[PDB]
Amino acid sequence: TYTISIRVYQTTPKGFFRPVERTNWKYANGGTWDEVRGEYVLTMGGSGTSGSLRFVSSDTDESFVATFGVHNYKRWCDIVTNLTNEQTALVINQEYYGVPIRDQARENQLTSYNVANAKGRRFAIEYTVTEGDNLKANLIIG
Amino acid sequence: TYTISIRVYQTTPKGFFRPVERTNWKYANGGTWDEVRGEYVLTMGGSGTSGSLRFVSSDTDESFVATFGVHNYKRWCDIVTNLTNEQTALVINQEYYGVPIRDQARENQLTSYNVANAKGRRFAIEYTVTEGDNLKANLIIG
Amino acid sequence: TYTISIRVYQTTPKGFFRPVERTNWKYANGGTWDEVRGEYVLTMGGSGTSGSLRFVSSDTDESFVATFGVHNYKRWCDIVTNLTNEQTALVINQEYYGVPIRDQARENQLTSYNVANAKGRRFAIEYTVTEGDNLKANLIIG
Amino acid sequence: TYTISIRVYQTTPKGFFRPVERTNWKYANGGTWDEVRGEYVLTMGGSGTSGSLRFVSSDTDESFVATFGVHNYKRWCDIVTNLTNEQTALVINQEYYGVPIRDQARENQLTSYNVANAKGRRFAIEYTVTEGDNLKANLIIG
Ligand SMILES: [C]C(=O)[N][C]1[C](O[C]2O[C]([C][O])[C]([O])[C]([O])[C]2[O])[C]([O])[C]([C][O])O2[C]1O2[C][C]([N])C([O])=O
Ligand SMILES: [C]C(=O)[N][C]1[C](O[C]2O[C]([C][O])[C]([O])[C]([O])[C]2[O])[C]([O])[C]([C][O])O2[C]1O2[C][C]([N])C([O])=O
Ligand SMILES: [C]C(=O)[N][C]1[C](O[C]2O[C]([C][O])[C]([O])[C]([O])[C]2[O])[C]([O])[C]([C][O])O2[C]1O2[C][C]([N])C([O])=O
Ligand SMILES: [C]C(=O)[N][C]1[C](O[C]2O[C]([C][O])[C]([O])[C]([O])[C]2[O])[C]([O])[C]([C][O])O2[C]1O2[C][C]([N])C([O])=O
Ligand SMILES: CC(=O)N[C@@H]1[C@@H](O)[C@H](O)[C@@H](CO)O[C@@H]1O
Ligand SMILES: CC(=O)N[C@@H]1[C@@H](O)[C@H](O)[C@@H](CO)O[C@@H]1O
Ligand SMILES: CC(=O)N[C@@H]1[C@@H](O)[C@H](O)[C@@H](CO)O[C@@H]1O
Ligand SMILES: CC(=O)N[C@@H]1[C@@H](O)[C@H](O)[C@@H](CO)O[C@@H]1O
């Protein structure tokens, strides 16, 4: 069993991102999302799957999907923003198992990733515990 | 804009179903899930999309996916249980736009549905508000 | 350290009780409330304190407070309903350390308790794990 | 009826503050706490009462209580930190109706307030809507 525990940080009172969606990819017997002590906890049965969280700021017409998983026994993460209305977490999560650019992001097995949207706001994932079954990450909204 | 506000009722202290997943299908400009006053609220850009909630009772090895949406300007609902490990809400939600028996449940535009798992536990959805932009449903776990 | 983990069951689709308040008494170095995998978890520093949860059904103008704690190394529980508007969980929780009938309920160290409100609705607390540091209870709304 | 809707911003990936308590003072027909679209909403029957939230960062031994209310038809707010183990939100909330320095903080009817703990971390409340029945505020953890 792997877990990925996620702490969400929102660094500026400009806009407000709320949680709107959480998905589980079907590989390795799937997975679950849990709220545990104010954290998002992704539990997976083995290596080779993932889960996504979508956040939306309606004040500023902004959004992003953050995906976390384990690929060949190492954690990975990715952020996708500049989402169309058709790009829900359900769509984005699935794409990490067929779309080349998404595949590569997952294949990179990164301990940290950051990206800016069209408005120049940065989003980041940083794993604070990068090894073992029980992984920890910060999700940082700039 | 459509909303569907869901009240969850767990009726018997045998096992414990917890929320593990919430998805949004991509049609009609997507949609979102919100927690509002102890209720799950699905917001949708217009007619023709849906969202799924998955619940798991790990005590008793039981689970189900409940799906809610609007089809041709009327509400619909369905429950799927006896899930394989591969059947997350991500997977199930999509099947309502291609798989014939799932297509049928959507086309049925039901105000009320119920089914049972192989263990004999019943799951039900009853809309209490069936018309208009702001719909309401009970999700009853037996 | 004691923990009491609480599963809430709402048994009838008549009215809807939503969580509105969660308090901690000051004795034994206090304590915290956490949400953990869909359950309410009361964590306390040692024996001799407690915490309260209030639920409101504004549809039917019903409310109650359920209090959980440890007194002389045994778990206890109680429910107060037919609440005035001035009887928040903040108020009720404190009454268990000065008000004689509340004191008595705490001193009973019950593994289960049930009571009916003005409208004949039954509320129940039933501990499923009655011994040790990590206690479990069902909160059942009839 | 007054509402105060609160958006929480945790700005710094050092330590993690989780919600552990939410209370309602008994005056003016009391009040309730709701989770609404990822925000904390305090509802109160009229002017002259309040509610408190407590947040704890176990990793760094930090905590605080943030209190919001309406005093003589104008909003107020306060933060207390450097807490003892006996100072739960239950205790702090009610000190605003008896303890002079706390009474004064409330009598100030502030639209913004900030204070630091002994470790130098700033906490802040910033009302973004300051007038009328439905007030809005940012809670910023530095
Ligand atoms: C070990 C790992 O991680 N692997 C991976 C995978 O996962 C998998 O899947 C399968 C189906 O296919 C099953 O489910 C199992 O259980 C799991 O584990 C996948 O995910 C992939 C992506 O696609 O990746 C990885 O691997 C690699 C190899 N080479 C293959 O391809 O298989
Ligand atoms: C009106 C309605 O409801 N419709 C529907 C639909 O939805 C749609 O989709 C599209 C794509 O394709 C888009 O997205 C839009 O926006 C929406 O709205 C669909 O869903 C279907 C299912 O498949 O169903 C319904 O319909 C039928 C017909 N075609 C019509 O349209 O009417
Ligand atoms: C051990 C026990 O449980 N005890 C109890 C108590 O608690 C206490 O408190 C105190 C203050 O005062 C402190 O905080 C400590 O820490 C604790 O532990 C109390 O609560 C009481 C009630 O009031 O009860 C019990 O007890 C015993 C005797 N009997 C007396 O009373 O004291
Ligand atoms: C209007 C206002 O805000 N006022 C106030 C108050 O509140 C009140 O309280 C009472 C009892 O006593 C009752 O509950 C009612 O309902 C309410 O409204 C209080 O809070 C106070 C503080 O302590 O403050 C205010 O005021 C002033 C003086 N004290 C008088 O006026 O009385
Ligand atoms: C700005 C943006 O969202 N770009 C994303 C990038 O972050 C992600 O790594 C890549 C692979 O999924 O797909 C997009 O190009
Ligand atoms: C036992 C079970 O899960 N049955 C489901 C049924 O409830 C649902 O209406 C149908 C269409 O999606 O798919 C399955 O037959
Ligand atoms: C109907 C009702 O709520 N009665 C309660 C009772 O359940 C509780 O055990 C006792 C001590 O606190 O007093 C209260 O009034
Ligand atoms: C560091 C600290 O917690 N100081 C608080 C202050 O913020 C508050 O305004 C006052 C009134 O309650 O009580 C204390 O002095």
Of the listed ligands, the closest to the CA of A74 is 1
Residues contacting residue D9 through CB under 8 Å, at least 6 positions apart: A10, A11, A12, A13, D138, D139, D140, D141
Q: Which residue from B minimizes the CA distance to C6?
A: B16
Q: Bridge-partner residues for D43, per DSSP? A: D3, D32
Measured CA to CA, the distance from residue A66 to residue A75 in angstroms comes to 14
Q: How far is C44 from chain A (nearest CA, A)?
A: 15
Q: How far is B41 from chain A (nearest CA, A)?
A: 10
User: Sign of the CA dihedral A92, A98, A99, A105?
Assistant: positive
Residues contacting residue A15 through CB under 8 Å, at least 6 positions apart: A57, A59, A60, A62, A121
CA distances (Å), origin C79, targets B129, C96, C112, D105: 32, 11, 11, 35
Q: Suggest the residue from C3, C32, C34, C36 to mutate for an interface test with chain A (most A CBs closer than 10 A).
A: C36
CA distances (Å), origin D100, targets D8, D53, D80: 28, 21, 14
Of the listed ligands, the closest to the CA of A44 is 1
Please calculate the CA angle C123-C128-C131 and round it to the nearest 5 degrees.
125
Taking CB atoms and an 8 Å cutoff, what residues of chain A touch D37? 18
The residue to which tokens 């949860």 are assigned: C53
Kindly state if the Cβ of B58 falls inside 6 Å of ligand 6. Answer: no
Please name which of A42, A118, A108, A124 lies closest in space to residue A76, comparing C-alpha atoms: A108
Coil vs helix vs strand at D129: strand
Question: What DSSP letter does each residue of D71-115 carry, written as one string?
Answer: ETTEEEEEEEES--TT--HHHHHHHTTT-HHHHHHHHT--SEEEE
Q: How far is D40 from chain B (nearest CA, A)?
A: 10
CB A74 within 8 A of CB A106: no
Alpha carbon of residue C73 to chain centroid = 17
Within chain B, residue ranges assigned H as helices are 89-95, 100-107
Residues contacting residue B77 through CB under 8 Å, at least 6 positions apart: B66, B67, B68, B69, B110, B113, B125, B127, B137
Residues contacting residue B22 through CB under 8 Å, at least 6 positions apart: A21, A22, A23, B33, B40, B51, B52, B53, B54, B89
CA distances (Å), origin C27, targets C32, C74, D98: 12, 15, 21
Amino acid at B116: A
For chain D, list the domains and their CATH numbers: 1-142 (2.60.270.20)
Q: How many CB atoms lie within 10 A of CB B85?
A: 13
CB D135 within 8 A of CB D5: yes
- Ligand 1 geometric centre to CA of A96 (Å): 12
Taking CB atoms and an 8 Å cutoff, what residues of chain C touch B10? 8-11
Q: Which residue from D minimizes the CA distance to C27?
A: D86
Taking CB atoms and an 8 Å cutoff, what residues of chain B touch D34? 36-38
Indicate the pairing of strand A39-44 with strand A2-10: antiparallel
Taking CB atoms and an 8 Å cutoff, what residues of chain A touch B91? 26
Measured CA to CA, the distance from residue C104 to residue A57 in angstroms comes to 50
Measured CA to CA, the distance from residue B37 to residue B78 in angstroms comes to 24
The residue to which tokens 């809807």 are assigned: C16
- On the CB side of B13, how many CA atoms lie within 13 Å of its CA? 15
Q: Copy the structure tokens of residue A91.
A: 């769509």
- On the CB side of A129, how many CA atoms lie within 13 Å of its CA? 11
If residue A102 lies in a helix (H) or strand (E), which one and from where to where? helix A100-107
Measured CA to CA, the distance from residue D95 to residue D103 in angstroms comes to 8
Measured CA to CA, the distance from residue B35 to residue B43 in angstroms comes to 11
For ligand 4, pick from D27, D44, D94 the residue to mutate: most ligand atoms within 8 Å of CB.
D27
CA distances (Å), origin D53, targets A137, D18, D78: 25, 10, 11
Amino acid at D141: I
Q: How many CB atoms lie within 10 A of CB C58?
A: 14
Q: Bridge-partner residues for A78, per DSSP? A: A67
Dihedral class, residue D115 (left if φ above 0, else alpha if ψ from -120 to 50, else beta): beta
Question: What DSSP letter does each residue of C42-97 carry, written as one string?
Answer: EEESSSS-EEEEEEEETTTTEEEEEEEEEETTEEEEEEEES--TT--HHHHHHHTT
Q: Bridge-partner residues for A55, per DSSP? A: A19, A64
Taking CB atoms and an 8 Å cutoff, what residues of chain B touch C13? 7, 9, 126, 138, 140
The residue to which tokens 């206690």 are assigned: C135
**What is the SS3 string spanning B32-54?**
EEEEECCEEEEEECCCCCEEEEE
| A→C interface, C-beta within 8 Å | 34-38
Question: Is the Cβ pair B37, D37 closer than 8 Å?
Answer: no
For ligand 4, pick from D47, D50, D78, D106 the residue to mutate: most ligand atoms within 8 Å of CB.
D47
Q: How many angstroms is the resolution?
A: 2.4
Question: Is the Cβ pair A34, C34 closer than 8 Å?
Answer: no
Q: Copy the structure tokens of residue B138.
A: 């009970």
CB A42 within 8 A of CB A6: yes
Phi, psi for residue A101 in degrees, rounded to 5: -60, -35
CB B30 within 8 A of CB A88: yes
Residues contacting residue A87 through CB under 8 Å, at least 6 positions apart: A65, A80, B26, B30
Q: How far is B35 from chain D (nearest CA, A)?
A: 6
Helix, strand and coil content of chain A, in percent to the nearest 5, comes to 15, 55, 35
